Structure formats: C-alpha cells, structure tokens
UniProtKB/TrEMBL annotation, chains A, B:
Keywords: Calcium, Metal-binding
Residues annotated as domain SnoaL-like: 13-105
GO molecular function, one term: metal ion binding
Keyword S-adenosyl-L-methionine carried by entry: no
Protein name per its UniProtKB record: SnoaL-like domain-containing protein
Originating species: Paraburkholderia xenovorans (strain LB400)
Highest taxon listed in the record's lineage: Bacteria
Length: 128, 128
C-alpha cells in the first residue's frame, strides 16, 4: 500500500520546512503530545507546542541544511542530515516513531565531523 | 512470527560480544560483504573481515559499554548505546540494515555529551 510512502512524503515536507525555517510546517508532523529527547544531554521536551517554541527561539532556522538519507520501515523512521550555523556543521540523526501517521517520539543526536585517521586509510573507501 | 525477535536476539548477542571484546562473536551478525559507514568522516569499510580487523586493532575493546535502547521494524534496526575509553564516553548510534538475517549495511555515529542549557531548563524534563 501507500503507508510508508505517505510517511516519507510527510518527512520530506518536514525537512523542507526545517530548512526553510517554517516552524509551523516543521511541526505539523507531530502528535500533540510528542516527546523529543536529546540523549547527549539527558533532556526531554514534552509536547508539540513546547518543541516548536523552543526550536523557534534557539537555534532557530539553520544557515545550512541538507538531508543525507532517510530510511524507514513501518512506524520507525531515521533521518540522517546536516545542519550548520556559523560555518560549523553538525551530522545529525533524527529517530522518529510514528503512530497513526504522526510522530509520537523523536530522538535526536548532534555529532561533529572527525578526520578519517591515517592508520586505516589503506582499508577504507572515502565516500563522503 | 518470530522474525524481528530473532534479529533482536542476534543484536543483544552482538552487543554483548562488543562489551566483552569477543571480536569473533561481534562480527557473526554481518554478511560477508557488509559495509560500515562513518558519515562523520566520510569513511566506508567494506567486508566483515576488514571490519573486524580494523575494530580489533583500534580502538579495540571498550573500557565501558551500555545499551540505551534498541528499536527495530522489519529489516531496519537502530541501537543507541554508550562506549567509553579513558573516562570519555561517546553516545553512539548504530543503524543496521538486514537481509536474510544478516547485516548488510551499518552506519555509525559517535557523539559527545553536552550540558543541558540553562535557558530551556524550565521547559525540559531531565530523564538521563
Ligand atoms: Ca493531548
Ligand atoms: Ca561475498
């Protein structure tokens, strides 16, 4: 059927909204009681309203945004993407759990680039 | 049926192996031609053999290991976990794609802790 492709459509629009700084559009995808976790800091945000207000406040719209990859099966979705402010990018992961077509739980990680180490160069492909 | 639960069983064993530094057991889960990507560095590792040798070499067995959460649907799996060396932990994400019960593509991210910022304290729950 269309179920996964419908989620993927919603996700494409979500990320477009995020790049565009359309905070309303960016939060359309969430259940009202959606939770958003940052495990790196132990923080949990409760509710679509709170999530939108917090994001809109800071850091606000990214200066740079690009989706790397979106994978999903059933109600489990994961988006790999880059966001950047001040010429400092973050390799970002958003793990989303859906119910009835809406996000009920998002978990985000924000990671730094690192240099491919010389020692294993002979054994890796550089794919970007 | 049992399909997902069978993958989850394999994953539990995978991570136990990783904590234990059992590099053989740790690599049982992969297809022979499995690829492992580090998007933060643009590196791709091709093959179970290469992946095992590289991991075994450096950084080798973690001084500290703990699974945070495992989610999965069908052939898409994502493990959130912590690894630590020298009292420096990394909030890690491993995204795994399965085919016929074996990992064909893993993508890993290694992220730092960050302090929950004061400004949004009134609006977040600290869950750890
Ligand atoms: Ca409600
Ligand atoms: Ca082969």
């Amino acid at each position: 059927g269309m179920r996964e492709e419908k989620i993927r459509e919603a996700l494409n629009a979500h990320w477009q909204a995020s790049a565009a700084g359309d905070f309303d559009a960016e939060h359309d995808i969430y259940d009202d009681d959606a939770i958003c976790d940052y495990p790196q800091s132990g923080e949990r945000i409760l509710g679509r309203m709170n999530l939108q207000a917090l994001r809109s406040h800071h850091p606000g719209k990214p200066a740079g945004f690009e989706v790397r990859r979106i994978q999903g099966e059933g109600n489990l979705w994961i988006t790999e993407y880059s966001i950047s402010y001040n010429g400092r990018p973050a390799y970002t992961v958003s793990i989303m759990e859906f119910r009835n077509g809406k996000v009920v739980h998002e978990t985000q990680y924000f990671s730094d680039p690192f240099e491919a180490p010389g020692w294993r160069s002979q054994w890796v492909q550089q794919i970007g």
